[PDB]
Design an enzyme around this catalytic site. Structure first.
Site, PDB file in Angstrom:
ATOM      1  N   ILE A 182     -69.547 -46.424  -8.346  1.00  0.00           N
ATOM      2  CA  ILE A 182     -68.579 -46.219  -9.433  1.00  0.00           C
ATOM      3  C   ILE A 182     -68.787 -46.694 -10.618  1.00  0.00           C
ATOM      4  O   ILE A 182     -68.084 -46.102 -11.635  1.00  0.00           O
ATOM      5  CB  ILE A 182     -67.247 -46.998  -8.814  1.00  0.00           C
ATOM      6  CG1 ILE A 182     -67.522 -48.671  -8.761  1.00  0.00           C
ATOM      7  CG2 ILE A 182     -66.731 -46.480  -7.609  1.00  0.00           C
ATOM      8  CD1 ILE A 182     -66.304 -49.406  -8.492  1.00  0.00           C
ATOM      9  N   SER A 203     -77.762 -50.594 -17.382  1.00  0.00           N
ATOM     10  CA  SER A 203     -79.412 -50.993 -17.265  1.00  0.00           C
ATOM     11  C   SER A 203     -79.534 -52.254 -16.365  1.00  0.00           C
ATOM     12  O   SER A 203     -80.623 -52.014 -15.698  1.00  0.00           O
ATOM     13  CB  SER A 203     -79.601 -51.471 -18.602  1.00  0.00           C
ATOM     14  OG  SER A 203     -78.428 -52.796 -19.172  1.00  0.00           O
ATOM     15  N   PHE A 204     -78.466 -52.833 -16.033  1.00  0.00           N
ATOM     16  CA  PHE A 204     -78.564 -53.941 -15.055  1.00  0.00           C
ATOM     17  C   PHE A 204     -78.599 -53.491 -13.769  1.00  0.00           C
ATOM     18  O   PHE A 204     -79.163 -54.104 -12.788  1.00  0.00           O
ATOM     19  CB  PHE A 204     -77.140 -54.890 -15.094  1.00  0.00           C
ATOM     20  CG  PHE A 204     -75.984 -54.226 -14.788  1.00  0.00           C
ATOM     21  CD1 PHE A 204     -75.748 -53.826 -13.291  1.00  0.00           C
ATOM     22  CD2 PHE A 204     -75.028 -53.562 -15.739  1.00  0.00           C
ATOM     23  CE1 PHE A 204     -74.668 -53.082 -13.060  1.00  0.00           C
ATOM     24  CE2 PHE A 204     -74.034 -52.927 -15.509  1.00  0.00           C
ATOM     25  CZ  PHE A 204     -73.795 -52.777 -14.078  1.00  0.00           C
ATOM     26  N   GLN A 222     -76.118 -51.058 -10.478  1.00  0.00           N
ATOM     27  CA  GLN A 222     -75.208 -50.166 -10.150  1.00  0.00           C
ATOM     28  C   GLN A 222     -74.155 -51.128  -9.878  1.00  0.00           C
ATOM     29  O   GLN A 222     -74.005 -52.144  -9.421  1.00  0.00           O
ATOM     30  CB  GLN A 222     -75.604 -49.466  -9.018  1.00  0.00           C
ATOM     31  CG  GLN A 222     -76.799 -48.460  -9.633  1.00  0.00           C
ATOM     32  CD  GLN A 222     -77.359 -47.661  -8.495  1.00  0.00           C
ATOM     33  OE1 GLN A 222     -77.241 -46.441  -8.545  1.00  0.00           O
ATOM     34  NE2 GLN A 222     -77.864 -48.049  -7.438  1.00  0.00           N
ATOM     35  N   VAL A 223     -72.801 -50.437  -9.661  1.00  0.00           N
ATOM     36  CA  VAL A 223     -71.656 -50.886  -9.007  1.00  0.00           C
ATOM     37  C   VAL A 223     -71.346 -49.983  -8.088  1.00  0.00           C
ATOM     38  O   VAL A 223     -71.069 -48.805  -8.236  1.00  0.00           O
ATOM     39  CB  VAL A 223     -70.478 -51.339 -10.237  1.00  0.00           C
ATOM     40  CG1 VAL A 223     -69.161 -51.833  -9.497  1.00  0.00           C
ATOM     41  CG2 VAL A 223     -71.070 -52.141 -11.011  1.00  0.00           C
ATOM     42  N   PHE A 232     -67.133 -58.595  -6.476  1.00  0.00           N
ATOM     43  CA  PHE A 232     -65.926 -58.895  -7.303  1.00  0.00           C
ATOM     44  C   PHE A 232     -64.988 -58.520  -6.664  1.00  0.00           C
ATOM     45  O   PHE A 232     -64.980 -57.192  -5.581  1.00  0.00           O
ATOM     46  CB  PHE A 232     -66.158 -58.128  -8.639  1.00  0.00           C
ATOM     47  CG  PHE A 232     -67.173 -58.733  -9.575  1.00  0.00           C
ATOM     48  CD1 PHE A 232     -66.783 -59.945 -10.253  1.00  0.00           C
ATOM     49  CD2 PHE A 232     -68.450 -58.070  -9.766  1.00  0.00           C
ATOM     50  CE1 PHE A 232     -67.868 -60.301 -11.220  1.00  0.00           C
ATOM     51  CE2 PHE A 232     -69.274 -58.739 -10.626  1.00  0.00           C
ATOM     52  CZ  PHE A 232     -69.106 -60.029 -11.356  1.00  0.00           C
ATOM     53  N   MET A 273     -61.682 -55.797  -6.652  1.00  0.00           N
ATOM     54  CA  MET A 273     -61.599 -54.287  -6.724  1.00  0.00           C
ATOM     55  C   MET A 273     -60.324 -54.315  -7.827  1.00  0.00           C
ATOM     56  O   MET A 273     -59.330 -54.603  -7.237  1.00  0.00           O
ATOM     57  CB  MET A 273     -61.434 -53.688  -5.668  1.00  0.00           C
ATOM     58  CG  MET A 273     -61.233 -51.973  -6.154  1.00  0.00           C
ATOM     59  SD  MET A 273     -63.000 -51.179  -6.289  1.00  0.00           S
ATOM     60  CE  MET A 273     -62.459 -49.746  -6.814  1.00  0.00           C
ATOM     61  N   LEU A 274     -60.745 -54.070  -8.829  1.00  0.00           N
ATOM     62  CA  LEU A 274     -59.406 -53.714  -9.850  1.00  0.00           C
ATOM     63  C   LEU A 274     -59.254 -52.020 -10.120  1.00  0.00           C
ATOM     64  O   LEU A 274     -60.044 -51.120  -9.475  1.00  0.00           O
ATOM     65  CB  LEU A 274     -59.870 -54.244 -11.211  1.00  0.00           C
ATOM     66  CG  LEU A 274     -60.168 -55.753 -11.182  1.00  0.00           C
ATOM     67  CD1 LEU A 274     -60.889 -56.098 -12.208  1.00  0.00           C
ATOM     68  CD2 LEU A 274     -58.719 -56.543 -11.197  1.00  0.00           C
ATOM     69  N   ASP A 301     -68.635 -59.015 -26.037  1.00  0.00           N
ATOM     70  CA  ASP A 301     -68.800 -57.451 -25.898  1.00  0.00           C
ATOM     71  C   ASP A 301     -67.517 -56.782 -25.422  1.00  0.00           C
ATOM     72  O   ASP A 301     -67.328 -55.874 -24.712  1.00  0.00           O
ATOM     73  CB  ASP A 301     -69.939 -56.964 -24.961  1.00  0.00           C
ATOM     74  CG  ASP A 301     -70.019 -55.506 -25.288  1.00  0.00           C
ATOM     75  OD1 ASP A 301     -69.928 -54.793 -26.295  1.00  0.00           O
ATOM     76  OD2 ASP A 301     -70.483 -54.895 -24.245  1.00  0.00           O
TER      77      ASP A 301
HETATM   78  C1  LIG Z   1     -66.804 -52.625 -16.019  1.00  0.00           C
HETATM   79  O1  LIG Z   1     -66.747 -51.101 -15.768  1.00  0.00           O
HETATM   80  C2  LIG Z   1     -67.978 -50.570 -15.730  1.00  0.00           C
HETATM   81  C3  LIG Z   1     -68.074 -49.184 -15.744  1.00  0.00           C
HETATM   82  N1  LIG Z   1     -67.637 -48.457 -17.004  1.00  0.00           N
HETATM   83  C4  LIG Z   1     -66.379 -49.231 -17.765  1.00  0.00           C
HETATM   84  C5  LIG Z   1     -68.343 -47.495 -17.341  1.00  0.00           C
HETATM   85  O2  LIG Z   1     -68.936 -47.039 -16.776  1.00  0.00           O
HETATM   86  C6  LIG Z   1     -67.709 -46.707 -18.691  1.00  0.00           C
HETATM   87  C7  LIG Z   1     -68.586 -46.734 -19.532  1.00  0.00           C
HETATM   88  C8  LIG Z   1     -68.306 -46.102 -20.917  1.00  0.00           C
HETATM   89  C9  LIG Z   1     -66.962 -45.630 -20.981  1.00  0.00           C
HETATM   90  C10 LIG Z   1     -65.997 -45.441 -19.699  1.00  0.00           C
HETATM   91  C11 LIG Z   1     -66.587 -46.241 -18.612  1.00  0.00           C
HETATM   92  C12 LIG Z   1     -66.920 -48.646 -14.616  1.00  0.00           C
HETATM   93  C13 LIG Z   1     -67.162 -49.116 -13.286  1.00  0.00           C
HETATM   94  O3  LIG Z   1     -68.497 -49.840 -13.349  1.00  0.00           O
HETATM   95  C14 LIG Z   1     -68.656 -50.922 -14.412  1.00  0.00           C
HETATM   96  C15 LIG Z   1     -70.372 -50.757 -14.386  1.00  0.00           C
HETATM   97  N2  LIG Z   1     -68.411 -52.214 -13.794  1.00  0.00           N
HETATM   98  C16 LIG Z   1     -68.792 -53.403 -13.880  1.00  0.00           C
HETATM   99  C17 LIG Z   1     -69.801 -53.961 -14.573  1.00  0.00           C
HETATM  100  C18 LIG Z   1     -70.212 -55.146 -14.641  1.00  0.00           C
HETATM  101  C19 LIG Z   1     -69.453 -56.209 -14.254  1.00  0.00           C
HETATM  102  C20 LIG Z   1     -68.164 -55.665 -13.291  1.00  0.00           C
HETATM  103  C21 LIG Z   1     -68.005 -54.139 -13.298  1.00  0.00           C
HETATM  104  C22 LIG Z   1     -67.034 -53.527 -12.415  1.00  0.00           C
HETATM  105  C23 LIG Z   1     -66.108 -53.947 -11.772  1.00  0.00           C
HETATM  106  C24 LIG Z   1     -65.313 -53.136 -11.260  1.00  0.00           C
HETATM  107  C25 LIG Z   1     -65.404 -51.775 -11.833  1.00  0.00           C
HETATM  108  C26 LIG Z   1     -64.622 -50.356 -11.246  1.00  0.00           C
HETATM  109  C27 LIG Z   1     -63.436 -50.184 -10.616  1.00  0.00           C
HETATM  110  C28 LIG Z   1     -63.195 -49.038 -10.433  1.00  0.00           C
HETATM  111  C29 LIG Z   1     -63.759 -47.957 -10.853  1.00  0.00           C
HETATM  112  C30 LIG Z   1     -64.898 -48.184 -11.672  1.00  0.00           C
HETATM  113  C31 LIG Z   1     -65.293 -49.639 -11.948  1.00  0.00           C
HETATM  114  N3  LIG Z   1     -66.440 -50.009 -12.517  1.00  0.00           N
HETATM  115  C32 LIG Z   1     -66.440 -51.191 -12.328  1.00  0.00           C
HETATM  116  C33 LIG Z   1     -67.253 -52.093 -12.799  1.00  0.00           C
HETATM  117  C34 LIG Z   1     -64.096 -53.906 -10.353  1.00  0.00           C
HETATM  118  O4  LIG Z   1     -63.274 -53.029  -9.731  1.00  0.00           O
HETATM  119  N4  LIG Z   1     -64.495 -54.877 -10.647  1.00  0.00           N
HETATM  120  C35 LIG Z   1     -65.506 -55.230 -11.275  1.00  0.00           C
END
Ligand SMILES: CO[C@@H]1[C@H](N(C)C(=O)c2ccccc2)C[C@H]2O[C@]1(C)n1c3ccccc3c3c4c(c5c6ccccc6n2c5c31)C(=O)NC4
Length: 342
Positions: A32, A36-37, A39-40, A105, A107-108, A154
């Site tokens: 999802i 750089s760190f 994957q999620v 984490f 799930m949001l 950030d």
């Molecule tokens: C903060 O969202 C990031 C991801 N972006 C916002 C993007 O890739 C985008 C970048 C630019 C523009 C739009 C989206 C979405 C996705 O994965 C990321 C890496 N993540 C991280 C990164 C670091 C710590 C925690 C998270 C979480 C988290 C969640 C998450 C996501 C849930 C549902 C769909 C996508 C999603 N993501 C999540 C995500 C989450 O539910 N808990 C932490």
């Protein structure tokens, strides 16, 4: 060419596979997010019987050490009793799996940038923006706890996630790149659009730089566009000045990078260095928000809670967040006492 026995690609990222079962506990659904760190991943936790987001850190020292700092801040934050902690994404636990650090984490739902995208970048109501504003201010009050003193570093719409897709509750996520008050280690920080003046001028900075970010975010949430969409630091500062005017002389006299954007004339005052902009202070926030013209682009004409009075309180709050001086820039506790929240 095999990496970590076939489990990794050439970036030391785990090759994600849908349906994979980890430790007879986590059922991996899909990828999802990415960075750089690493994957999620979306997954189901059999023991707790709930959906979780697992951040799988790259199998690389640089990224693992960074993630261990994240884990410290999160645990530090999640220990504190106070109820202000329920605007930070909860870190449930962590573990090592096939040489990757894994953060679990809650799930949001969608993030505030998804929200803007759905409106086709026309924005959300002032009434929803107020709700987000209060929750973000409360989360900042929390980060300002003296024993925490955390700078998120950030803040932006994509880093602010909705709890449930049918409610206004939000949480700040991703403290991977999160500064902490103290000796200055970093200078190139924040995402450009939301980068404060003190950072741009290479000056001392503190928790107030998050407050600047928040001001930019709230305007963006209501108009649908970024307030200061600079393509580079010169463009960024020039756009900030359009709305807010030339920064005060006493700041620029101290600013190590003043001369990247400004020149000191023979009379002693500071002007912009020439490099297509409106004169200083002439792209008024009043008009950006459409205070008297029915909101941004007139689209709120006749919607309740969008009177001139309502817009004046919001405008005032925003201006106090966009103060050039981080010493007097409004603090979280006072933000929450503003008329805009009454
Ligand atoms: C903060 O969202 C990031 C991801 N972006 C916002 C993007 O890739 C985008 C970048 C630019 C523009 C739009 C989206 C979405 C996705 O994965 C990321 C890496 N993540 C991280 C990164 C670091 C710590 C925690 C998270 C979480 C988290 C969640 C998450 C996501 C849930 C549902 C769909 C996508 C999603 N993501 C999540 C995500 C989450 O539910 N808990 C932490």
């Amino acid at each position: 060419k095999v990496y970590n026995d076939g489990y990794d690609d050439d970036n030391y990222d785990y090759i994600v596979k849908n349906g994979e079962k980890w430790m007879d506990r986590y059922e991996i659904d899909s990828l999802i997010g990415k960075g750089s760190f690493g994957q999620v991943v979306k997954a189901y936790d059999r023991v707790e019987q709930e959906w979780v987001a697992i951040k799988i850190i790259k199998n690389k020292k640089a990224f693992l050490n960074q993630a261990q700092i994240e884990v410290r801040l999160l645990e530090l934050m999640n220990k504190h009793d106070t109820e202000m902690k329920y605007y930070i994404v909860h870190l449930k636990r962590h573990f090592m799996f096939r040489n990757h650090l894994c953060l679990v984490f809650e799930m949001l739902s969608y993030n505030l940038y998804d929200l803007l995208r759905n409106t086709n970048f026309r924005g959300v109501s002032l009434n929803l923006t107020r709700k987000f504003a209060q929750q973000m201010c409360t989360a900042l009050l929390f980060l300002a706890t003296p024993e925490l003193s955390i700078i998120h570093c950030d803040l932006k719409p994509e880093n602010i996630l909705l709890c449930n897709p049918k409610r206004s509750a939000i949480k700040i996520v991703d403290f991977g790149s999160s500064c902490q008050l103290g000796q200055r280690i970093y200078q190139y920080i924040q995402s450009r659009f939301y980068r404060s003046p003190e950072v741009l001028l290479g000056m001392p900075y503190d928790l107030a730089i998050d407050m600047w970010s928040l001001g930019c975010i709230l305007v963006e949430m209501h108009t649908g566009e970024p307030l200061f969409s600079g393509a580079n630091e010169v463009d960024q500062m020039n756009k900030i000045v359009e709305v807010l005017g030339i920064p005060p002389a006493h700041i620029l006299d101290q600013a190590p990078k003043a001369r990247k954007f400004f020149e000191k004339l023979p009379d002693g005052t500071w002007n912009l260095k020439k490099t297509e902009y409106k004169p200083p202070g002439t792209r008024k926030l009043h008009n950006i928000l459409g205070v008297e013209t029915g909101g941004p682009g007139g689209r709120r004409a006749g919607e309740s809670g969008h009177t001139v009075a309502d817009y004046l309180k919001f405008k005032d709050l925003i201006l106090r967040m966009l103060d050039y001086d981080p010493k007097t820039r409004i603090q979280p506790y006072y933000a929450l006492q503003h008329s805009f929240f009454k």
